Design an enzyme around this catalytic site. Structure first.
Site, PDB file in Angstrom:
ATOM      1  N   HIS A  62       0.805  -1.204   0.000  1.00  0.00           N
ATOM      2  CA  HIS A  62       0.000   0.000   0.000  1.00  0.00           C
ATOM      3  C   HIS A  62       0.841   1.257   0.000  1.00  0.00           C
ATOM      4  O   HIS A  62       0.475   2.266  -0.616  1.00  0.00           O
ATOM      5  CB  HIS A  62      -0.947   0.051   1.198  1.00  0.00           C
ATOM      6  N   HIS A  92       5.278   7.102   6.739  1.00  0.00           N
ATOM      7  CA  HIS A  92       5.083   6.588   5.387  1.00  0.00           C
ATOM      8  C   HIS A  92       4.611   7.747   4.522  1.00  0.00           C
ATOM      9  O   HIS A  92       4.387   8.854   5.022  1.00  0.00           O
ATOM     10  CB  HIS A  92       4.019   5.452   5.422  1.00  0.00           C
ATOM     11  N   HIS A  94       2.157   9.044   0.868  1.00  0.00           N
ATOM     12  CA  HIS A  94       1.189   8.812  -0.204  1.00  0.00           C
ATOM     13  C   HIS A  94       1.632   9.710  -1.342  1.00  0.00           C
ATOM     14  O   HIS A  94       2.092  10.846  -1.127  1.00  0.00           O
ATOM     15  CB  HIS A  94      -0.212   9.251   0.249  1.00  0.00           C
ATOM     16  N   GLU A 104      -3.164  13.583   0.249  1.00  0.00           N
ATOM     17  CA  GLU A 104      -4.488  13.201   0.792  1.00  0.00           C
ATOM     18  C   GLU A 104      -5.242  14.441   1.205  1.00  0.00           C
ATOM     19  O   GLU A 104      -6.342  14.733   0.710  1.00  0.00           O
ATOM     20  CB  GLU A 104      -4.271  12.176   1.895  1.00  0.00           C
ATOM     21  N   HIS A 117       3.289  11.211   6.347  1.00  0.00           N
ATOM     22  CA  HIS A 117       2.561  11.029   7.613  1.00  0.00           C
ATOM     23  C   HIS A 117       3.520  10.443   8.649  1.00  0.00           C
ATOM     24  O   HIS A 117       3.993   9.322   8.476  1.00  0.00           O
ATOM     25  CB  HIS A 117       1.392  10.066   7.389  1.00  0.00           C
ATOM     26  N   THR A 196      -6.452   7.269   7.239  1.00  0.00           N
ATOM     27  CA  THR A 196      -6.854   7.449   5.835  1.00  0.00           C
ATOM     28  C   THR A 196      -6.832   6.148   5.078  1.00  0.00           C
ATOM     29  O   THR A 196      -7.155   6.129   3.882  1.00  0.00           O
ATOM     30  CB  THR A 196      -6.009   8.506   5.118  1.00  0.00           C
TER      31      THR A 196
HETATM   32  N1  LIG Z   1      -2.493   7.232   6.572  1.00  0.00           N
HETATM   33  S1  LIG Z   1      -2.559   7.434   8.146  1.00  0.00           S
HETATM   34  O1  LIG Z   1      -3.879   7.880   8.547  1.00  0.00           O
HETATM   35  O2  LIG Z   1      -1.414   8.203   8.617  1.00  0.00           O
HETATM   36  C1  LIG Z   1      -2.355   5.827   8.860  1.00  0.00           C
HETATM   37  C2  LIG Z   1      -2.239   4.722   8.017  1.00  0.00           C
HETATM   38  C3  LIG Z   1      -2.148   3.446   8.508  1.00  0.00           C
HETATM   39  C4  LIG Z   1      -2.093   3.241   9.873  1.00  0.00           C
HETATM   40  C5  LIG Z   1      -2.077   1.831  10.446  1.00  0.00           C
HETATM   41  O3  LIG Z   1      -1.631   1.676  11.580  1.00  0.00           O
HETATM   42  C6  LIG Z   1      -2.882   0.750   9.756  1.00  0.00           C
HETATM   43  S2  LIG Z   1      -2.963  -0.851  10.552  1.00  0.00           S
HETATM   44  C7  LIG Z   1      -4.059  -0.670  11.935  1.00  0.00           C
HETATM   45  N2  LIG Z   1      -4.583   0.536  12.269  1.00  0.00           N
HETATM   46  C8  LIG Z   1      -5.408   0.693  13.358  1.00  0.00           C
HETATM   47  C9  LIG Z   1      -5.739  -0.409  14.088  1.00  0.00           C
HETATM   48  C10 LIG Z   1      -5.226  -1.669  13.698  1.00  0.00           C
HETATM   49  N3  LIG Z   1      -4.390  -1.797  12.630  1.00  0.00           N
HETATM   50  C11 LIG Z   1      -2.128   4.337  10.773  1.00  0.00           C
HETATM   51  C12 LIG Z   1      -2.271   5.656  10.245  1.00  0.00           C
HETATM   52 CL1  LIG Z   1      -2.471   6.942  11.336  1.00  0.00          CL
HETATM   53 ZN   LIG Z   2      -0.934   7.986   5.649  1.00  0.00          ZN
END
Ligand SMILES: NS(=O)(=O)c1ccc(C(=O)CSc2ncccn2)cc1Cl
Ligand SMILES: [Zn+2]
Length: 258
Positions: A62, A92, A94, A104, A117, A196
């Site tokens: 992803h 990471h 996007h 985003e 992020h 997101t």
């Molecule tokens: N794009 S973003 O919003 O910054 C973002 C993307 C992926 C994840 C993960 O931790 C995904 S896995 C997961 N998340 C919550 C609960 C169980 N597993 C966290 C964040 Cl804050």
């Molecule tokens: Zn993100």
């Protein structure tokens, strides 16, 4: 048939597996700069990344993510709109297929070429998984990328991407200093939102910096050489891994400046 960014498994499909996709505090959002209210009570953001310990870098199909040792108070975010102390766990990006899309969040409908992020969890909840179940569990520092001059502090990341080209590849990635990804100003917008990506949990205080960083075309070219697919599957370049802006609903975006 798992989630992604394609026509048959992309953002418009995610609500089937994750009904919170149509929730009351989803992210990202368009930041309408004229409507955001300056809040004099907001504090400067405190970013304390001096003792950060990066561990590994992983292509998860992803995005790619750099994970940190978050088992002690090392790299922490506080102040700003936050109550208490948030531990950096990963960052990471996007990004787009072309420089006119990829972010985003948007700013007066403007899309940036990419968005960084930096994901942090509230230490009052002990671990990132527990924190993800709380409305104030996570804080994400979001930083826009525009294409122009290179960011020297990003080069160590881009130079190892050839070693994690396909989904499921990882490598050791120590001594990376995330301070080299930050713009000069810590002026920001903030609002309550969500992950997101699936599972889309409504657990994030978003802190989006107003000043973008510049990265070069050669740097973002290397992001675009990553693959969504695992090795041996048909090749699909990892591009356009961004969720579009979601309804603001009953939220106010606050500005730390103006
Ligand atoms: N794009 S973003 O919003 O910054 C973002 C993307 C992926 C994840 C993960 O931790 C995904 S896995 C997961 N998340 C919550 C609960 C169980 N597993 C966290 C964040 Cl804050
Ligand atoms: Zn993100």
């Amino acid at each position: 048939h798992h989630w992604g960014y394609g026509k048959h498994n992309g953002p418009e499909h995610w609500h089937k597996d994750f009904p919170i996709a149509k929730g009351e505090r989803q992210s990202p959002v368009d930041i309408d700069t004229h409507t955001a209210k300056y809040d004099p009570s907001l504090k400067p953001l405190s970013v304390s990344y001096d003792q950060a310990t990066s561990l590994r870098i992983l292509n998860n199909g992803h995005s790619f993510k750099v994970e940190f040792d978050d088992s002690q108070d090392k790299a922490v975010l506080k102040g700003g709109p936050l109550d208490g102390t948030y531990r950096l766990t990963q960052f990471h990006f996007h990004w787009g297929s072309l420089d006119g899309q990829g972010s985003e969040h948007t700013v007066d409908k403007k899309k940036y070429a990419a968005e960084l992020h930096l994901v942090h969890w509230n230490t009052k909840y002990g671990d990132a998984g527990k924190a993800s179940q709380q409305p104030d569990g996570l804080a994400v520092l979001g930083i826009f990328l525009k294409v122009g001059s290179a960011k020297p502090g990003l080069q160590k990341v881009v130079d190892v991407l050839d070693s994690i080209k396909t989904k499921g590849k990882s490598a050791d990635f120590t001594n990376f200093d995330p301070r080299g990804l930050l713009p000069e100003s810590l002026d920001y917008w903030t609002y309550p939102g969500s992950l997101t990506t699936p599972p889309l949990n409504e657990c994030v205080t978003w802190i989006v910096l107003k000043e973008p960083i510049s990265v070069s075309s050669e740097q973002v070219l290397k992001f675009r050489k990553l693959n969504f697919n695992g090795e041996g599957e048909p090749e699909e370049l990892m591009v356009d891994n961004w969720r579009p802006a979601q309804p603001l609903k009953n939220r106010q975006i606050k500005a730390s400046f103006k």
